[PDB]
Design a protein around this ligand. Structure first.
Ligand SMILES: *C(=O)CCCC1CCNCC1
Ligand SMILES: [Ca+2]
Length: 223
């Protein structure tokens, strides 16, 4: 996250770190046995780390659970990143409480101007790499579809939305992929792609979760 602040330990209880010997993507806990992340974060050998703040030190509250299966959306397109969403089932259920809790799925989509919270352990520099130890947060608004399409002509599908600042300086960045975009207590987006990090006129693009609620519910119910 570039231009963000330190969230504070366990203040984002649904945030998870996907680990393969190092942190490579974020995710969101939606129930005790399932996490939602981005399809482009897929790989085998994923260990889900819950209740984290400093990802390089065991501080207490951490729960490390292996993924039993990962389900990439059947229509995911790696070239356009359309349908960039994946579900991960945990080998055992997580222990929920105040430091580890699930986030609710939306009932309606959010409108332009809604302020959301984006969090993650991704790069904090737009020009070069600096990865933080603790979780960073950023408050960002959802932009209008016209500003989003004017920024990325021909690349925005109806399963994506832009959030951020056109002036540059504040954005999600590499390492934040797969993580949550929460607005009014509902998971509305997943960090997906953008051009560089916090560049002027190039906001971040997020997977529009409200378009997948029935798919998520139906997939969880059958697995
Ligand atoms: C995931 O970490 C790949 C890059 C994610 C982009 C970075 C720029 N802001 C939008 C998300
Ligand atoms: Ca830790």
């Amino acid at each position: 996250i570039v231009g963000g602040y330190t969230c504070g330990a366990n203040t984002v209880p649904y945030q998870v770190s996907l680990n393969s010997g190092y942190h490579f993507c974020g995710g969101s806990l939606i129930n005790s046995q399932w996490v939602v992340s981005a399809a482009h974060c897929y790989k085998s050998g994923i260990q889900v780390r819950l209740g984290e703040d400093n990802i390089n030190v065991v501080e207490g509250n951490e729960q490390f659970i292996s993924a039993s299966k990962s389900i990439v959306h059947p229509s995911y397109n790696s070239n356009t990143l359309n349908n960039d969403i994946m579900l991960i089932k945990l080998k055992s259920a997580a222990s929920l409480n105040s430091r580890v809790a699930s986030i609710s799925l939306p009932t309606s989509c959010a409108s332009a101007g809604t302020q959301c919270l984006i969090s993650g352990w991704g790069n904090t520099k737009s020009s070069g790499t600096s990865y933080p130890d603790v979780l960073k947060c950023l408050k960002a608004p959802i932009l209008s579809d016209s500003s989003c399409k004017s920024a990325y002509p021909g690349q925005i599908t109806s399963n994506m939305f832009c959030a951020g600042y056109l002036e540059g300086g504040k954005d999600s960045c590499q390492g934040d992929s797969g993580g949550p975009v929460v607005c009014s207590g509902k998971l509305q987006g997943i960090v997906s792609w953008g051009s560089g990090c916090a560049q002027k006129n190039k906001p971040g693009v997020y997977t529009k979760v409200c378009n997948y609620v029935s798919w998520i519910k139906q997939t969880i119910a059958s697995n």
